[PDB]
Design a binder for this molecule. Structure first.
Ligand SMILES: [Cl-]
Ligand SMILES: [Cl-]
Ligand SMILES: [Cl-]
Ligand SMILES: [Cl-]
Ligand SMILES: [Cl-]
Ligand SMILES: [Cl-]
Lengths: 217, 211, 211, 211, 217, 217
């Protein structure tokens, strides 16, 4: 028996774990880049642990989600589903990299890390908006919802512009290097870039679900 | 979200409650004071109506909310009827300078108070509702309790109502027939306060069944 | 899901139906028997109330369901009023030992029976409802039929009610004025059984319009 | 979607409005004409009932729609009660050849007209509703206005009702007690036209709170 | 202050812009095929402009979407989301082609353009059904909805059959040519075919959303 | 005029057809592995037939889906949509294999068939839960729903663990063989593995939809 909590709290705790999980991809890739595969394997164990922890929070929620409630149970589940995908993506990406001992070519290392970080920043915005949501639930009234969405869109546009530029730069550099590499490796590098971008796509879906919830009120 | 409804119910209860000292004044022949108490009843009704107006013009503006706007409006409508009923009853009594016959006085007041008690139960359940909103399965216990408490009040008011009508029946031959009919109407109107309170509980119950 | 409501409606119909032999007893001066029949009426009401309580404390616990929990509760509330009305009417009649004047006796019973018939139609539609639930387009035919059947009953009860009031009016000068008013009230109360039955049909109709 | 409801409300208003010339006929001792006017009242009620039947058998068949089918049905039910009330009142008056005492005649007609005016407000809001449907935030102004207009009508009808009952009370000793009670009942029934109109507004308000 | 408009009108105007955006892929690819990369770049600027314009209409709708209304706000948003993806797909595809100066092999040029056009035709059907929807909203009654859906399915089956045949033909010809090409280019040609097909998949989702809306009434 | 049937029955009959369709992939691949392409073509004709049959059941449902009903029409449609994708996936996969006469390398044959079978088992669980759903609709009460979901999650976790292990093993073996193969073939083998896994992903979505339905009650 604790004090009253938002119906959104368990979702926020899940998002926080997910973000921690995705965040670990930076040091994971940084390890792969210095050639320390033993450390990369240990960081992947941290990713796997965070994903397992998220999965437990997710199970808890699915078997618990309720009487009088200010949001739809189904919207919370749909939100949980998208958040969960982010942690699985991070686990999957890191697994494929360990699996192929995939080395990001020297010339692409700096921009790749910048791109990866900006994609993780998108997850960060998703975390931010899910936390900022208590403010609307605790207070809120016809209108404050519109400002919230407008802000969310402004912040996502900024992140998308940067991630789009970095993704182009990265693909342009890879394209210049193709002739120096094995074609299967080349394809897996493009796939890695795409998978990383998927972290940001998934984060956008989180925000879309929030937006749909706000549009039912 | 329930807070403004609770404030309105409180005002409505205060309005209806004044019927006891109102009637007590008439019974001691204090018509000047009964007129003053009716002024307090009218004021409470007017204040209630203001709270009602504000809720009606605000609720629509509500965003995320744990109960239906429409359920709150329906609840408000039922609550409001109670204050209006108290105002109407008191006005008819002043208008006819209606005298309760001596032998009915004590049981009439006991019956009126028990009908008010029914309004009190409605006030109590609307305030206990925060507990359910602030905190599945608990809704059934809450409804079981409200039903238990209402059954107790209903049994008592039914007995009192029977007793009172039996006594009036015995006296009819000593009274003017129009006066008699107005005495029966007064008993019926007072009973209506309890019927309206029951409706408030029903609306709460429907709200809880939607979750 | 409709089954418990059907069981309750059946009990309610049985309760209201007892008003015919109740009144027939009073009309033959059998006040001891009318008291016994009123005991059966009270018992049916009590049993109905129990079924009501169980539904209210269960419905909330319902999972997947083809009708709204709230519609079932609203239906239950209307059905319950019918038994309560029968209990109330019979109690007032015992209380005043109310005698229907000789010349009104036959038409009064015919009118009461026709009002009961309205309760019977409600019972019939609530039972025919399984057919619609067990099996789009068929809902319109069902409502067209209920309206047709009710129009027939309403026409007959309107005529009887007019006839009965016309006869009482002709007799007023030979009776005590309070007794007269109670005779008009009794006619009105009996008519209310049909009004309540109509409300049961309306709630069914709303349920069907949600689909 | 609101159009058929508007047509029905218009018919209902026409039906209730005929109570003024109906009563005026009785007051000038024109019982043959009052019977003819009651025939017009019955006809309007019958036409209203037909429109009602068609809506009930059609609404269900509706596809995409900006309001709830159930809200429209509930609105229709309340509107219909007004025509039925006018028909019932007029029938009781013919049946008893009820004479309003001379001194109450003018204020009675003023009171009846003001109660009709309440029906008129309902008719007006149901027609202004297209404006809201054809075109967020505007719903609050619409409800604020309806409340303002109703408060004005209610104040006037309350005053008239008080005046009329005060005058009847002063005359009771000169009249037959049953006749007196029927005069009070008539005043109450007429007031009910305004109560029903208020319910029509409430249903509109609930519809607007769902959006 | 104009005359009454359908709640669907702003969605129709967005769909129209989206279709215009996707449509530009034909002349875009036609330019790449004659080897005029300067013109292809200029046509991509037209695609990018149409996507930016759509994005503004989309923002407008998201910050506006309402009182009494014949459809669910959330269904409109979900519809908008799918329509938006079509314009982004067109912008993304054209960007990758400019990025790699991707040349469709001679033998595949004619069938590729036919396939691309038929995929754009699917978008066209989506536009058609969104416009035809006013008819159901303006009139409509239990039943007219079923004929609408049946028609929609018939028309989509026809387009799907053709696009499936063209996609097979195109892949079969590419497969015969693989030995003459660089393997990375080969993979990007298959990807291009897939991305183009995605225009039709997205269009189908638009129709699915409409179908779900009709099923709530 | 038959006896009363669950609103879920037509969906169950569709799922059954879908499962039959996906199931045919085992003998289809087994034929491709013994080198009997004539038989593989005949088995694909059986797959195509099952998909066409499913498509007809689907059309029937879409043009029929109702008065009083214990579930949302829209949830049934959304469920149908996911089930349909499984049959299309099976038809698409088999078509690409016939198209390229794609041979699974000897060393990967046994594990590939095991993996394919376990993915089909996921479809099997989806079929199981859709059939078990009548039990909840026929009886059921606040609470039995939670046990149903908990069971579903337990069973899916088991299948996912196995499919994840088999997928890793299979990719690890392919990675060891890459140097012996044409790079385009290599990419298509990875794609095949991914597409097969997609059968299980689609099956999971079926279960997610069921879970959302149960969460509205
Ligand atoms: Cl790529
Ligand atoms: Cl009485
Ligand atoms: Cl009467
Ligand atoms: Cl009165
Ligand atoms: Cl491909
Ligand atoms: Cl892969």
């Amino acid at each position: 028996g604790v004090f009253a909590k938002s119906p959104i709290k368990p979702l926020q705790e899940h998002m926080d774990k997910v973000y921690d999980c995705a965040s670990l991809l930076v040091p994971f890739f940084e390890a792969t880049i210095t050639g320390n595969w033993d450390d990369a394997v240990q960081i992947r164990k941290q990713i796997s642990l965070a994903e397992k922890q998220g999965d437990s929070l997710k199970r808890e929620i699915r078997l618990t989600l309720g009487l009088f409630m200010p949001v739809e149970r189904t919207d919370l589940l749909e939100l949980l589903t998208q958040q969960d995908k982010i942690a699985n993506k991070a686990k999957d990406i890191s697994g494929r990299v360990i699996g192929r001992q995939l080395l990001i070519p020297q010339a692409l290392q700096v921009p790749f890390i910048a791109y990866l970080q900006r994609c993780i920043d998108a997850v960060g915005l998703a975390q931010q908006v899910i936390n900022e949501l208590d403010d609307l639930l605790e207070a809120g009234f016809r209108g404050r919802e519109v400002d919230f969405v407008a802000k969310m869109i402004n912040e996502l546009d900024i992140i998308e512009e940067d991630t789009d530029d970095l993704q182009i730069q990265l693909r342009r550099q890879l394209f210049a290097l193709e002739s120096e590499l094995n074609p299967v490796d080349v394809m897996f590098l493009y796939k890695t870039i795409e998978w990383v971008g998927g972290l940001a796509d998934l984060a956008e879906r989180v925000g879309s679900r929030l937006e749909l919830m706000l549009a039912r009120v």
